[PDB]
Structure formats: C-alpha cells, structure tokens
Amino acid sequence: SGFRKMAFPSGKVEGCMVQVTCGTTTLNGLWLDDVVYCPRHVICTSEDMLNPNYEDLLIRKSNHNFLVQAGNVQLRVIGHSMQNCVLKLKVDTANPKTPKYKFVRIQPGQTFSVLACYNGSPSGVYQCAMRPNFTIKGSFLNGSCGSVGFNIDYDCVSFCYMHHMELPTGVHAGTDLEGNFYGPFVDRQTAQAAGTDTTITVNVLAWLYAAVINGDRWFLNRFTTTLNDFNLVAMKYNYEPLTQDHVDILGPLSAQTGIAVLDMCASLKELLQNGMNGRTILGSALLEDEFTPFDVVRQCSGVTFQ
Amino acid sequence: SGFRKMAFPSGKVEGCMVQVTCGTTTLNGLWLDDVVYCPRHVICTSEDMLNPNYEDLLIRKSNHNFLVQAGNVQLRVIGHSMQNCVLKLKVDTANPKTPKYKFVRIQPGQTFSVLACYNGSPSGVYQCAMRPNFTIKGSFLNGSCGSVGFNIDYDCVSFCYMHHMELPTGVHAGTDLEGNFYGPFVDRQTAQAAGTDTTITVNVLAWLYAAVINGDRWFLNRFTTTLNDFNLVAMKYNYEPLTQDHVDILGPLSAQTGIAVLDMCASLKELLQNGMNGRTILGSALLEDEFTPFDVVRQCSGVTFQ
Ligand SMILES: *[C@H](O)[C@H](C[C@@H]1CCNC1=O)NC(=O)[C@H](CC(C)C)NC(=O)OCc1ccccc1
Ligand SMILES: *[C@H](O)[C@H](C[C@@H]1CCNC1=O)NC(=O)[C@H](CC(C)C)NC(=O)OCc1ccccc1
C-alpha cells in the first residue's frame, strides 16, 4: 500500500534529448528518427524576444547555423522548417534509440511526466497535470525549453508537451509536438494573463478513492447527494462541474471500494464546506487534483511498462 | 521558477532490473556486472514467511532452482550466496548496461529516488526520504520487493535501498545493498513496531529557503532566536534538534537569500506555535521535510547528470 506522486520511468525519453544551439541561444531538442524538434525561439537573441517576427528571423538562418549535439557527437543539419511554434531540423543520422512513439494533444485534467533537461542532459523527472486554464505548475529555469512531457502506454511513448515559457505569475506554458500552444499563449516576452485556475473535480474524487483503498476513511459521511446539487456547491469553490461521463470513468473505482460515486460526492461536499479541520488525507492537508482515475488504478494495481 | 518533488532520471537503473523466480515466488533483482542481487525471502513459500530459518531453507536450493530473466533473455545462475538479508546470484553474463555504480548506506533525513518494479519491469519513479525511524513512506504492492532506491552523482549511480517489507502501519522497510536492514527490522512476517516518526528540521528549513527563492515570503517575521531556544520549541512538536553542522549545511542557502539561519528558525518557530492559518507555502498546507538542502540547491540551480 501507500500512495505517491509517481512519474513514468524516463529511460526511453532520456535517449532522445539533444542540445540545440543557434548563435548564442542553447536549449533542448527532441531527436526522433532523423528529425530534431525544438522551440522556435532558439533563433532569437535576448532583444528579439520582446516582439519577434519569426519568419523574418528564420530567413537569415541556414542549416549550418544550427549546432545539434547528442552528448559529445555532432549531428549534421540537412534541412530545417518551422511548424507553428516548433522548428523541425532534419539531421543526417536517425536516432538509434528511437522508441515507439506517438504525438498526442492532451485535454485539461490529464497528467503526464516532465523530464526537465538543461544542455540536452536530464536533470530530473516529475509528474504534473494540464490545468484547466492550459498552464502547468512546473519547475523550469533558464535553458529548460525543449524539455518534454510524456506518457507511456506499455511500450509506446506518447509525447504531449514541449516547454516554451514561464508566465509572470510563476506558472508554465508550452506546446504540443506539432507546435500548437496549449491555451491562448504566444511565444513572445510580453505580459500574458492566465485565466482562473479551477480544481479538477474528477481527479479529486479519484484521489479520495485512493485514500479509501489505502485506509483513510474518516471523511466518509452518511449523506448522499445529486449531480446537480453537488455541482451547485462545486461551482462556488471554483471546482470543475461533474458530468455523467466523469461518473462512468470513476465506475471501476466505485466498484472496487463499494462506495457509490454520489456518496463520495457528498463526502467531498462536506470537505468543501467545513474544511478538513487540521486533519490530513494521504499525508496531504489539501485536496489533491493531479491524479487521474487512471493514475489511481495504475498505481494501486501495479501496471508496468516496457 | 517553481518547485516540484523531483526524482532522478531512471534510465541508468531501468537497464539493471531483472526478474528472479524461485519456485512459486517472483520478485525483482538488480543485475550489476555478473551478479544479481535480490531479497533472500525469494526462497520462501507463503507459509515459510511467518518464521523462516533462511539457512535451512537455502540448503535445499541449487543454482538451477533460481530462474533469472532479463525481459525475454535467460541468465544462467552459476553460483549463489547469502549476504545478510540479500542473495547474490552469480550469472554467466555480465550486464552490458552496467553503469558506474556504488553501494552507499544513507543516514536518516537523506533523500533518494525509488524505481518501483514488478516482474522486473519498471512501473514508476518517485522521491522519498529515509525517515528518522528508518522507515520510508513509499508505494509498494505485492511483487515489488527488489525494487531499489538510488541517487545519481553526475555519472555515478549510488544504490542505497532495496525494498523488503511493509509494516502493519503502512510504512516500508528495506536494506542497503549489502543486505543490512535500515532500522531494527527483520525479514519475517511478524508484528514489528516502528518508533516515533519525527520531522527532519534541517529539511524543513531548506524547503522554506526554496519558498523564499520562489517568491513565498509571507511567513518571514521580524523575530530572531537562538539554537537552544528553537530546539526547546522544536522538541515539543517532535522535530529533530538542530545542530551547528546543520547551520553550516544551510550556509549557501542563507547566503543566496540574505536571510540568516536563526532568522529562518524564528519564522519556523512561529509556524509551529500558531499554525499556517489556512495559508499555503509552495502549494502545500503542511511543512514539507523530504527536501534536503542539496535537493533545493540542485533544483534551483539546474544540476544535470550523464
Ligand atoms: C526557455 O528555456 C525559457 C524557459 C523559461 C525561463 C524561466 N523559466 C522558464 O520556464 N523561456 C523563455 O525565456 C521565454 C522565451 C520567449 C521567446 C517565449 N520567455 C519567458 O518565459 O519569459 C518569462 C517572462 C516573460 C514575460 C513576462 C514575465 C516573464
Ligand atoms: C515483497 O514484494 C513484499 C512487499 C510488500 C507486499 C505489500 N507491500 C509491500 O511492500 N514483501 C513481503 O511480502 C514481506 C515478506 C517477508 C518474508 C519479510 N512481508 C510483508 O511485508 O508483510 C506485510 C506484513 C507483515 C506483518 C504484519 C503486517 C503486514
């Protein structure tokens, strides 16, 4: 038993990270087959980042202006193109460590692992969730751009995130691997407000089920509720509304614990109105929403990968 | 900026995990050079685990009773010996993925990454601390034994933990890689009490420094204190006493933030006596003690590894 914020094993992604240098700027790239993907602001200087015209900046760059390094080996760039906010550098060498991979654009509330890198070398791995306002609460410093977020499905790595920027409020924004930003953000150094950050209700419920599986049952009450009555309370506390699809997704967790979803909603309603009164749940004094129902099943059943 | 519970990249350890089967029992082994390390209770049946005599049980086992599998490849066992609570199986093939490695026995308060495995395949990675009572608060199910804890120092993997058992209270116990248990535990299925779990004060202070580096300064007060006066308050709340060595270790964090260690101790003293009043620090409503001063420097400066 026990419950931890668990990241995916990073071995399959570590072998795909390279260092990309253009002039003075160095960030990380993702080397898959004979293509390196990296944020397009690698072609910017520090003054270009206030109001970059990426088309005009890219005209003055040739293949030989991009230095791609995989540890101590040099990759020769034989072609380059811009796809939305990412650059695709065609190199002369296919990555021999290329895993089975897929590009996926995730939905808010879904979780993934981030392999934080600097100069193309892994620094650490952690788990996070795409917030409802399309930000992530990450840990990134200068030089971390090009670090990727991923999920693993048995033997297939699903890349879903590439890091680009930090907002003035301390949260982080990036793109999918086709270069499309999550949310309304643009890759320029300007004031950009993020919307309201709401709590992922279906994830909180899955975490409460994980608590019951692990022996924390003090929050279970004798009340029940309805979907409409719960959502009326949930909206007041900036919680995401619960839908029938969410109830179906929680179905297997409800069957394993013998606690109906609406009964768990009533327990959550009491926690939202009266607080936790200094108590803790799974070692936390707040309601955690960065575990999906799948994350809970995966950790409480011991799913493994290639 | 930002701060996350960050684990080490697991790639170098994933290539060392194998599956070890003896009769009906299957757990994980660590394959380094031509030696596989695994918990010795792999030779037990379910009834042997109440009161195992490991010497008598091992007499009835030959080399060919141990089935070692690295994915789909079979390793031939050419020798076996018991070193404390671990078995060393000599195999005919040296692991070609053997990294630069070291065996280290860690001290309470130190942190490390756990690669949770089942059937020799990685399931996930998370960060934890050796508690002062020599337990860890992990996430382990049946079949997880032989999973290892590790640190990375540039290119060298330091193995410090191998998982063996879960206590009735839900916490976890294991050995170093020489088979010596952390704490007074023994590998038999019997009631074993753990001591009082105290809070690692030096780790809390490092985490408060990480909060200041990341813009959370509401808890900073105008008071200071002395080491003796702080420890008098710390002992009442089951906090580990702070020593002069701890002050020296926090030195670099104190110099980077311009906040003297004793001034931070006064802020902690106020948090212990008056609580946090519903506020949060780095997104937590409790005082976190699973970040060492080195972990904080490493994450806030972007240290990378091979
Ligand atoms: C890429 O490595 C870097 C990552 C940042 C550095 C601090 N933390 C991060 O996540 N990204 C940038 O420097 C990025 C580049 C633009 C061309 C998009 N800008 C950025 O994040 O600036 C921070 C900021 C911008 C505007 C107002 C306040 C802060
Ligand atoms: C090895 O895979 C396994 C790991 C356990 C299973 C549940 N969570 C874990 O961490 N270890 C054992 O089954 C271990 C074997 C003995 C020979 C040491 N026993 C164990 O942890 O039993 C749990 C327990 C023992 C006594 C009282 C209450 C619970």
UniProtKB/Swiss-Prot annotation, chains A, B:
Residue numbers annotated as active site: H41, C145
Coiled coil spans: none
Subcellular location: Host cytoplasm; Host Golgi apparatus; Host nucleus
UniProt cross-link Glycyl lysine isopeptide (Lys-Gly) (interchain with G-Cter in ubiquitin), position: K5, K90
Regulation: Inhibited by pyridone-containing alpha-ketoamides compounds 13a and 13b. In turn, alpha-ketoamide 13b (tert-butyl (1-((S)-1-(((S)-4-(benzylamino)-3,4-dioxo-1-((S)-2-oxopyrrolidin-3-yl)butan-2-yl)amino)-3-cyclopropyl-1-oxopropan-2-yl)-2-oxo-1,2-dihydropyridin-3-yl)carbamate) inhibits SARS-CoV-2 replication in human lung cells. Inhibited ex vivo by michael acceptor inhibitor N3. Inhibited ex vivo by compound 11a and 11b.
Signal sequence coordinates: none
Effect of L205V: In strain: Zeta/P.2
Chemical reaction(s) catalysed: TSAVLQ-|-SGFRK-NH2 and SGVTFQ-|-GKFKK the two peptides corresponding to the two self-cleavage sites of the SARS 3C-like proteinase are the two most reactive peptide substrates. The enzyme exhibits a strong preference for substrates containing Gln at P1 position and Leu at P2 position
Ranges facing Cytoplasmic side: 1-306
Limits of the Peptidase C30 domain: 1-306
Record function comment: Cleaves the C-terminus of replicase polyprotein at 11 sites. Recognizes substrates containing the core sequence [ILMVF]-Q-|-[SGACN]. Cleaves and inactivates human TRMT1, preventing tRNA guanine(26)-dimethylation of tRNAs. May cleave human NLRP1 in lung epithelial cells, thereby activating the NLRP1 inflammasome pathway. May cleave human GSDMD, triggering alternative GSDME-mediated epithelial cell death upon activation of the NLRP1 inflammasome, which may enhance the release interleukins 1B, 6, 16 and 18. Also able to bind an ADP-ribose-1''-phosphate (ADRP).
Oligomer and partners: 3CL-PRO exists as monomer and homodimer. Only the homodimer shows catalytic activity. Interacts with host FBXO22; this interaction promotes the proteasomal degradation of nsp5.
Name by which UniProt lists this protein: 3C-like proteinase nsp5
Organism, scientific name: Severe acute respiratory syndrome coronavirus 2
Gene: rep
Full-protein positions shown: 3264 to 3569 of 7096
